[model samples]
Target chain A: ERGEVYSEKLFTESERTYFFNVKENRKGDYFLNIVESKRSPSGDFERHSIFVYEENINEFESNLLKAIAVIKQKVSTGSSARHN
Target chain B: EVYSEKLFTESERTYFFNVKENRKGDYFLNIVESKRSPSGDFERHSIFVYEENINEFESNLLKAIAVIKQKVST
Candidate 1:
């Protein structure tokens, strides 16, 4: 039976919840699923999901971190500028 | 072309950021995470923030980071 190999949850501020799950498919291929959930105006739960396959993991992360570095730079500059 | 992109990585985790425009000309941000497992394997996770959701998403993210900063400074 295919099921979750591992799962983690992050509860951030602003009532948003994030889930990271590693799961296996029928072919025994493992993949990661990311889910973001929050409450809607109607008091219902809303969710967005994305999946990343095993083969793409390395390239995905390399690019991901590259983008994150840019964001981090912006934040650092913004914060220091604020202090000036 | 999908367009602008950026990325960041650490010891065990990596994050990717990309601004992509679909064929419809609608733009969105792709955020991805790659984490290394104890067994020497990598797991991947991703989220897409569309134009309509970026405002709210950034709002909350900044709020959370502000809290982190406050906690760290104390």
Candidate 2:
């Protein structure tokens, strides 16, 4: 944007971290994206990212949290159960 | 190993995400965990969004968070 605005949020669980960012484009629409990073057991590092648009963020976040909850619940219970 | 991680663009900072893959290259278990720690120790918050089952998953997850967001900080 000619004069842009931006915002971001931080979330953490266990040893992992994620960044959620939103910035205004030239047309004034917003774009959302995520950045995640973690350390590997081999003393190395890794990261991943995905882009989300303003139109799809609501749906995107909903599905993402759903998927995340399913995964975390499994890890939390030590694999005692799964939500497939 | 059953998992791999990747780093994103270098815009402001490098971000990461996790993906689970079997020896045969089945990509699954996608999640993003954010670290907001000042010190180098480590902290995290995570979530998942997958390709399959998204249709129903979105409906359920949205309703759940709408209620939860009122109570939690999210």
Candidate 3:
């Protein structure tokens, strides 16, 4: 069962699926969870997820953006790489 | 910043996110906006948010999510 909803979302393009959520638990803590469920080339569900707790929300958000910035730089510059 | 984008759909038509890691390991920030189209297709947009402006992006995202929770109830 899902807890109180801070917010929730899902994404799609063709067959790829990415699910995103922001919620509070019974313990009164909030979190962010994103799951990517994909239909394999052979046709099966392959799911991967990443979760962030309330306390780490600040650091998580900050770092994620940094990661994205790094990602964008590589993408735009056509450099194929960055941090290890 | 090294991130990848994935697509997911439920009812919302838009989404945004960034992948990140630190001492606590890895996580993500996913922001979304969903609106119906005349043909029932939603215009979804997802992006990456980074460290340069944490509070600005995070706080504003929370507010937007708050308003939608009540209005976009399904």
Task: Give the number of the best model, judged by TM-score.
Answer: 1
DockQ of 1: 0.12
What CA RMSD would you report for each candidate?
A: 11.7, 12.6, 15.4
Question: Lowest summed-lDDT stretch of 10 residues in model 2 chain B?
Answer: B7-16
Ranking by DockQ: 1, 2, 3
lDDT of 2: 0.45
lDDT of 2 by residue, A1-84 (tens): 342233343333333444554555677565655555555777565665555445444455554554445444444233456675
Cα displacement (angstroms), candidate 1, residue B10, comes to 27
Q: What is the iRMSD in Å for candidate 1?
A: 8.9
In model 3, which regions exceed 4 Å deviation? A76-84, B1-74
Off by over 4 Å in 1: A77-84, B1-3, B6-16, B19-29, B32-74
lDDT of 1 by residue, B1-74 (tens): 35445343445665557766678665666775667788989876667655544545554543433333343356
Which CAPRI category fits model 2?
incorrect
For model 1, residues A1-84, the per-residue Cα lDDT tens digits are 247666666665554576666776787666666678877777898776756665555555455445444443333223324464
Best by lDDT: 1
